[PDB]
Amino acid sequence: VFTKLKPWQIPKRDWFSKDFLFGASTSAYQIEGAWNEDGKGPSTWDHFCHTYPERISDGTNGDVAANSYHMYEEDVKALKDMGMKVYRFSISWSRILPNGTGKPNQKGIDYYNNLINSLIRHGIVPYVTIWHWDTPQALEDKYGGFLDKQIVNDYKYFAELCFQSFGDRVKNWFTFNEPHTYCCFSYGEGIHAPGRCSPGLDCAVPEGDSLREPYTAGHHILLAHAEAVELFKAHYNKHGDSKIGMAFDVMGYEPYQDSFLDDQARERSIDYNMGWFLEPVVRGDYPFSMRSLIGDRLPMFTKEEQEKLASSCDIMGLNYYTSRFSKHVDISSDYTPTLNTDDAYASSETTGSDGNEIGPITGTYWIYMYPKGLTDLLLIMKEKYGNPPIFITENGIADVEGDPEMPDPLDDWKRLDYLQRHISAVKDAIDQGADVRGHFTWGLIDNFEWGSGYSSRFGLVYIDKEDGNKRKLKKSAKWFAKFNSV
Amino acid sequence: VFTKLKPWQIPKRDWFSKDFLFGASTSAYQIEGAWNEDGKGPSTWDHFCHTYPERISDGTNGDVAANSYHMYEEDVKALKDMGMKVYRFSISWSRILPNGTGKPNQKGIDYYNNLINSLIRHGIVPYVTIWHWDTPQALEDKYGGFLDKQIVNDYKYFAELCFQSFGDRVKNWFTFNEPHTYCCFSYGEGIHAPGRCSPGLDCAVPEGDSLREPYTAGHHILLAHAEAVELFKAHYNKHGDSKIGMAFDVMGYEPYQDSFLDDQARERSIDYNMGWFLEPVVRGDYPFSMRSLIGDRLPMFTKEEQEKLASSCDIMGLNYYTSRFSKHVDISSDYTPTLNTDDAYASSETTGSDGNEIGPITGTYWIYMYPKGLTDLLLIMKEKYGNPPIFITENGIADVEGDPEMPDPLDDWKRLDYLQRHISAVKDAIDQGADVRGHFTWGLIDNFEWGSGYSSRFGLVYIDKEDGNKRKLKKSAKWFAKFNSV
Amino acid sequence: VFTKLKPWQIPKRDWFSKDFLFGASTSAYQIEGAWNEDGKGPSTWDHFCHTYPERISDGTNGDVAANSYHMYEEDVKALKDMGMKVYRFSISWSRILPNGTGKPNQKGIDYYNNLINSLIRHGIVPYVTIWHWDTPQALEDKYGGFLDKQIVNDYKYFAELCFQSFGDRVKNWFTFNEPHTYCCFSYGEGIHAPGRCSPGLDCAVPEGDSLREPYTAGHHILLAHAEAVELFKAHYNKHGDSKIGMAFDVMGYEPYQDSFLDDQARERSIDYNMGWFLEPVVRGDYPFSMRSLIGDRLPMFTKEEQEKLASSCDIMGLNYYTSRFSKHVDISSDYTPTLNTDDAYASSETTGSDGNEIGPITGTYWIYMYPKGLTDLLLIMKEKYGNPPIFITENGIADVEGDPEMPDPLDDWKRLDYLQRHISAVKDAIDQGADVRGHFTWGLIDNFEWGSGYSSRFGLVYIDKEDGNKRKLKKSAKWFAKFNSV
Amino acid sequence: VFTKLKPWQIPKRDWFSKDFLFGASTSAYQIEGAWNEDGKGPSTWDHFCHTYPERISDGTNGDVAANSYHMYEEDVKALKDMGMKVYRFSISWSRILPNGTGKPNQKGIDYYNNLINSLIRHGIVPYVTIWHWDTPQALEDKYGGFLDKQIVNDYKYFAELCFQSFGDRVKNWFTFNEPHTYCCFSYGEGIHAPGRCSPGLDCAVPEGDSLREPYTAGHHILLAHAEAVELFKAHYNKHGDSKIGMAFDVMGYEPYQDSFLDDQARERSIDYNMGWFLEPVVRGDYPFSMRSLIGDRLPMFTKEEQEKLASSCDIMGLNYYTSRFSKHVDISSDYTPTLNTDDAYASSETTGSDGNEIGPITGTYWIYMYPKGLTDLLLIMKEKYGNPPIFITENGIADVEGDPEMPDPLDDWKRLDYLQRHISAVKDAIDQGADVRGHFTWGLIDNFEWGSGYSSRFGLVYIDKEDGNKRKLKKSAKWFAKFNSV
Ligand SMILES: O=[N+]([O-])c1ccc(O)c([N+](=O)[O-])c1
Numbered sequence A, B, C, D: 001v002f003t004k005l006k007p008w009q010i011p012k013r014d015w016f017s018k019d020f021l022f023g024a025s026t027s028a029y030q031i032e033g034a035w036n037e038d039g040k041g042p043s044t045w046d047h048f049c050h051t052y053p054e055r056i057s058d059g060t061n062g063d064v065a066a067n068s069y070h071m072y073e074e075d076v077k078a079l080k081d082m083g084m085k086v087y088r089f090s091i092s093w094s095r096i097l098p099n100g101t102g103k104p105n106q107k108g109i110d111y112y113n114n115l116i117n118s119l120i121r122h123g124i125v126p127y128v129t130i131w132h133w134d135t136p137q138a139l140e141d142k143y144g145g146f147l148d149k150q151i152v153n154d155y156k157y158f159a160e161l162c163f164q165s166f167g168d169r170v171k172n173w174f175t176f177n178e179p180h181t182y183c184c185f186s187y188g189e190g191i192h193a194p195g196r197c198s199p200g201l202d203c204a205v206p207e208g209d210s211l212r213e214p215y216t217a218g219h220h221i222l223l224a225h226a227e228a229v230e231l232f233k234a235h236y237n238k239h240g241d242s243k244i245g246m247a248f249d250v251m252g253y254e255p256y257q258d259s260f261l262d263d264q265a266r267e268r269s270i271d272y273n274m275g276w277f278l279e280p281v282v283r284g285d286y287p288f289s290m291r292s293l294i295g296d297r298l299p300m301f302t303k304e305e306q307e308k309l310a311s312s313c314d315i316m317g318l319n320y321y322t323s324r325f326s327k328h329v330d331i332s333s334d335y336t337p338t339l340n341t342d343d344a345y346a347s348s349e350t351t352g353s354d355g356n357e358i359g360p361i362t363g364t365y366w367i368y369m370y371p372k373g374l375t376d377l378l379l380i381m382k383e384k385y386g387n388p389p390i391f392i393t394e395n396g397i398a399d400v401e402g403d404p405e406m407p408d409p410l411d412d413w414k415r416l417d418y419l420q421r422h423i424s425a426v427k428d429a430i431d432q433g434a435d436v437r438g439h440f441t442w443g444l445i446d447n448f449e450w451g452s453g454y455s456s457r458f459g460l461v462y463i464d465k466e467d468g469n470k471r472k473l474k475k476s477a478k479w480f481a482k483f484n485s486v
């Protein structure tokens, strides 16, 4: 049993202002393929699938993906067929600068220009993510990538190349997508590229430090962000018509039990999941809870860095899927952190004190449906962080390959119902005064879901692997066509 | 200008239930004198005035004080004349056990029995504080007093002697009064006996550690408390008619500025000022904020100790005078704590972000009038800590000797107005559901105010030093006589 | 110490609708100079500085001021450089009709036409104040100016000349600016032109009646207003695209103490400060509190006048700077009013019952920062007076010449912070449903601040007296350029 | 149609605390008879019926009334049969001091002692009204009664005689009952004894001043009250077990229409009806609205009088029947007050702006049922005047002689339903925190209703005029017997 909305509860486009923006997202590694064509350099993700293919659940990789490097016109067509106003895509760093640094790859640039111009031809606004986990392996080999401060200037140069090549047409940018997921998975658990973790943990490269490397990578992301935004505002915003921000993964939290301790744990969960990266772009420092618990493992900003970081986003993206219960862990003699996420002293529980799961499972094991958590986080943005302009830059569910209760990949009523509930939760936040400007479904098309490969399908549009990677509208996509009055 | 209540706003006795208790407090060192009579041993406070007399502002000490060791019948008479229902006094450890341990001093015991029996004769209920800063100097010399765990068992034995000698008549007990003030002043700033602080700070004995000794003393107080309460419940409560708790100094806090940082600082101020000692008797551990900021300087409880501490108070005393603004301090490279109170990362400010003091000065430099802070703390007790039974075991103001705006020591309209506002703030909390059971003014009589000597007068009843230490009712006391319908 | 907003609390242009209007104000006498050029007649203010120069604090006058009669193009340029959408300026009655009545001065008219056309050329909307304290001295000499009903028809004719000359281009008008300040200062205290007060008070011309002349002048203003608005609606609004109202000085009030008496005093303060002039344009009579306290000194309206006055504003301006505490004064034998403002029976106090000032001083002695008072008054407009369209037609602070804490006249972070807090308070009112349509800073440029001369600088733009009256953008002005995305 | 409460909405005794007091009231002139027996002097009411019998609607008077001077034991019996805990009765001044002053009438005293002792024998507490409109005609003849200050001392002496004769047994006193009704009717409209009004108005003695005499009488009542209470507290409250206050007639008010003017009118209605007499005993002065509108016709208090009046009631009685709409009247040229009640500038309307009466008629033309008005006034007491102890000292309805819809005088379901609704409204106020201590129905027995004679029956107990003035329990009385569990 999965209870759907009553029909009079289904969102209508008029619930939202005329300037509010509906769209969908993808990322370069997840859809493009052509991983070695036209001069493209390898990324950490090319390298990690090619050297540790067993770390992808279903044995696949992104060498071809949805083949959007050649089929992008079909991605544009599917957006136009759903009536979407915005497409949020990412630039593959390694496609445009094969060595991370130096000579731009002109074919890489032409590709983005082609997609950009096609969107504009079709009345769709491009929102661009500069970096989406996607680091050139040349920079990884040369100095350990995000673990070395040399990443800061190299990223700055990449960002600049984006502004120069695409900024006359692209007016909305996100520097980084999901720094918290990236740091935890790539350098804490190590299940994501480049696959690092502490000795004795199970990841491709157990030569790292799960209590230190995530913070180091994180700190360089934030410094990279501040440099790029400074450069943008000084030399690439002459009309004053362009906006730049960052997109954050966020989970909602509820206290595990009715207890002032779990109330405190909940605030530590949110600092750690959201405030890690958001509190630096707001005030130029990490949350106090994090500095107090993580100490010398969490680098200090200089005064110049504090001030460059504070107020560095015109827009913020929130990538939201699900929520957890937050359960208080005591500081004690018998307990020491082993993963970076242990430093919150709050375990994320899928079941609450009364023995119930937080909401219904939606397909993949980690997406429990809890739209209230999203409205809650949006009200924190409003009340605590100054109500800056929010886009929901990811929201959606997977259908899991071979699941007997999702036998027809186009009949995604479950995805549709989740998306309708979340859009309705965004309406709730807007009615309560939250400054939300858009909703971008993850994903436009089924794509390579990292460690799960293609086996997790997140698209509004089906990618038929047995039929030449053809784009087919699912039931969800067809609802959007009607909703957007196409 | 000091604005008084309008007359229709003045509390009436009927505002409060018939079982609600109005009373006054004193402590042994502050009123008794007779510091070496009838076999009494010296305390840390005898020693500290006799060895470091220059640490008392006005050059005085407690050798004679109000001379309540001989004039207690006049203290009883003054309570009866105001119509008070309760007298909260302390037992001098050194009077009853001159060496801290061993043979009881029978004259010391007789004295308390005399006071107790006189109160009961006069219809007044005795509430007894076992320890009020007042440690035998023999235990201080032998092992450093509260800095050594041997204090735990020695205190237990003292408490037991109290229960045995006085428990057939005394049914309400506080183990300790103001642990937070005691730890900060006696071992942090070192302005109170035994006068210890870090090398390089200005106190009588700069041989201590202002970042460690306060926590050590504190931890032993809490262990001493748990042992005494365990012993009490097991062997001294056979009728089940007796109650035992602890009394805490508390300041109200308001955020310095409208900022989520100062909201966070405020919660750290309250943990540090109130939760330091209260959160152990509630859950058997210190506040998480304190463990996170203080780490190895804050001792761990064993599991037996956690469980003995949790729910160890039947009643709690709140000693309230004033409030502060709490201002957020960042964890940074350039900042290290030097006093224990630095570990809150929240400075207590008397002036707020708009440049105004929190409330009017009342006489002594640290008592700013802010009755709202008291209602607020009472609602935290209710909402956060389970609404346990609260007594206001201290509340009041000083008149400062020689102040030209308080030229007549009996005309204390200012004290009266403050007390009426605070009683009215207690009524506010009770109307909002806070379980408040009594209000004890500090102090019954002018007394030795520690480092300020007699120059700070806190009494409802004037002690005429030029007229044989005679008790004279002030205007405040006379209001109580009417209020209590005498 | 002057605490600034946290950076995430700073208003952004998007807080406000696209039709909301940001602008700045000036007045003719305060900026124009050229006080006797091109046929211009003298005003009461020319006369009052020339006959009583000692009544201007710093010994200056408005003979040249900012020299905007010749430098208006630089005023326009400074508005365009800040990105302002609206300029609210006043018409000098005496420039356009040197004798008050009769032959128009064509050069006077040409001047306004030049400013108007320049604003429109530069995309800026003109909002025009017809009269801003600025009465022709010929009418003052002939019949005592606003003290004689002949002012009513003479003003009507002046207004008509404005509508005829400028109404094809100007579509928003205010008949009068700050009647309450004008009546109190010019005829009560007498510190403003024409400088009248009761015998025995200290003003230039103590031949008046501080209990009667303010009400007489006031009543004629209101009658003048009703005549001009009747004429406007009947003959100068053929497209129905024009709006006409009045602008009121207002202070916020808080009760001095928690007392139903001070609650009553507060409502009398607001009637006297705001309702004096606003309640006539709403219902066609003065507030009942005023008629009850002022009796025969407060003229009666006829029925025709009541009906002409009621609903006579399409738009209202609120000129807001600061707030006061209102303290109840008793009607008693021993007390009689001497100034008109005594008739409120409520003294305006800068300090409250707890001994604190209402908010921080901002430079000049009478501007205490209290943005909450503005939101409060805006909610009274909404809830009590029918939520008519409100413009904040003045709001700002002075920097005082020679103040050692404002040594650099362009570094006006203090002004900027006050303005950001007030804009944010306007946002608060709008979120609570108040119909606020614009915010005009006082002043566009440093100017002649009446009895304080040039020594009080109110501008967003500095007027460099040592550099040829050159316009220089202050830090506040530069913030507006960014805020308005220029 | 008169809609009754649903049965589950009917008050139960347990709705109220165990100390809450249910009782009934009467007054001396209205029930006693024996108007010239045993040495009793005549009152203003004896004189007024005997000289102006045509001013009593039904041609009757109080010469015999209920004959309670001889049948008081039946009044006691009826209270005991209903289970009442309290009887509020008045002392006839003229019975106990036939000449107003001088030799006490011992038989008059014996009578009250007999009633008092009988109540106590029967477990009923006496609450005594010293004066209830009932002035000795000797004082009326000698100096015009309440119009001369000599009434002040004469009343003081009468009160003292009461305290001396009855104070060992009577512990609760009201100095005066309904001063506002008394002043308006006796000296404004003149329909009550001594029957005075302005020349040209229709009353027995149109030789008075309806704009001045009510205030003069009122002011002396208040001075008389302050003197008696001062004397009481100083010499007749040695155990501190006695309480003294005043009882006020009050109507509820609602604004006639939704208009800030009617909101203002409503506050003037309440000041005039309730605050006239209540604001003096609270703060020692009349309401500001009254001083502002009434000026020299409203006498000033001296400072001694202000302070003697302020806080002069331990208890307050509210006599409540009904409510009105308050409609704003303008201060204008064409309008001058003729009756004292015109000075509120607020007409009391029985019908509201929507054309509906405020509530259902209950029998007599002026009692419209509106229990909400009572809860409202009780919350004003709580929120504005300090929540002093309130008794509802009168509340009830008349059955009108010959009314065809009340043909059986004992079947008073209508009275019962009104009383149940009002008791329930008192419960509402108590639940919202109002300090209400008792409910006394007017009246214990049918009695002489002043200008309406016996034709208005207000009793819980019927007085059978055709059967020897026999007491018969009505349906209402029988409900009380059950309610009070008899
Ligand atoms: O586990 N997560 O919270 C989470 C969030 C965003 C993500 O993108 C992913 N992910 O790609 O596996 C996981």
Ligand SMILES: O=[N+]([O-])c1ccc(O)c([N+](=O)[O-])c1
Pocket (backbone or CB within 6 Å): B178, B181, B249, B251, B366, B450
């Ligand atoms: O400074 N304090 O907060 C504070 C509290 C209780 C106290 O007893 C004292 N004291 O005795 O100095 C001081």
Ligand SMILES: O=[N+]([O-])c1ccc(O)c([N+](=O)[O-])c1
Pocket (backbone or CB within 6 Å): C178, C181, C249, C251, C366, C450
């Ligand atoms: O004192 N004021 O409230 C006030 C208001 C507006 C004003 O314009 C002035 N003023 O020009 O001096 C003063």
Ligand SMILES: O=[N+]([O-])c1ccc(O)c([N+](=O)[O-])c1
Pocket (backbone or CB within 6 Å): D178, D181, D249, D251, D366, D450
């Ligand atoms: O008319 N009234 O409001 C009112 C009030 C109390 C009353 O006692 C009377 N009365 O006796 O006629 C009348």
Ligand SMILES: *[C@H]1O[C@H](CO)[C@@H](O)[C@H](O)[C@H]1F
Pocket (backbone or CB within 6 Å): A027, A030, A177, A178, A319, A394, A442, A448, A449, A450, A458
């Ligand atoms: C947002 O989450 C989705 C779902 O896990 C991922 O595919 C994206 O890459 C991440 F950006």
Ligand SMILES: *[C@H]1O[C@H](CO)[C@@H](O)[C@H](O)[C@H]1F
Pocket (backbone or CB within 6 Å): B027, B030, B177, B178, B319, B394, B442, B448, B449, B450, B458
């Ligand atoms: C409570 O505070 C008072 C006032 O500072 C001290 O005298 C007491 O000893 C403390 F217990």
Ligand SMILES: *[C@H]1O[C@H](CO)[C@@H](O)[C@H](O)[C@H]1F
Pocket (backbone or CB within 6 Å): C027, C030, C177, C178, C319, C394, C442, C448, C449, C450, C458
């Ligand atoms: C508004 O107030 C400002 C500041 O006092 C004055 O300069 C203006 O003339 C008045 F309209």
Ligand SMILES: *[C@H]1O[C@H](CO)[C@@H](O)[C@H](O)[C@H]1F
Pocket (backbone or CB within 6 Å): D027, D030, D177, D178, D319, D394, D442, D448, D449, D450, D458
């Ligand atoms: C209370 O009102 C009742 C009903 O009008 C009168 O009879 C009383 O005398 C008055 F006190």
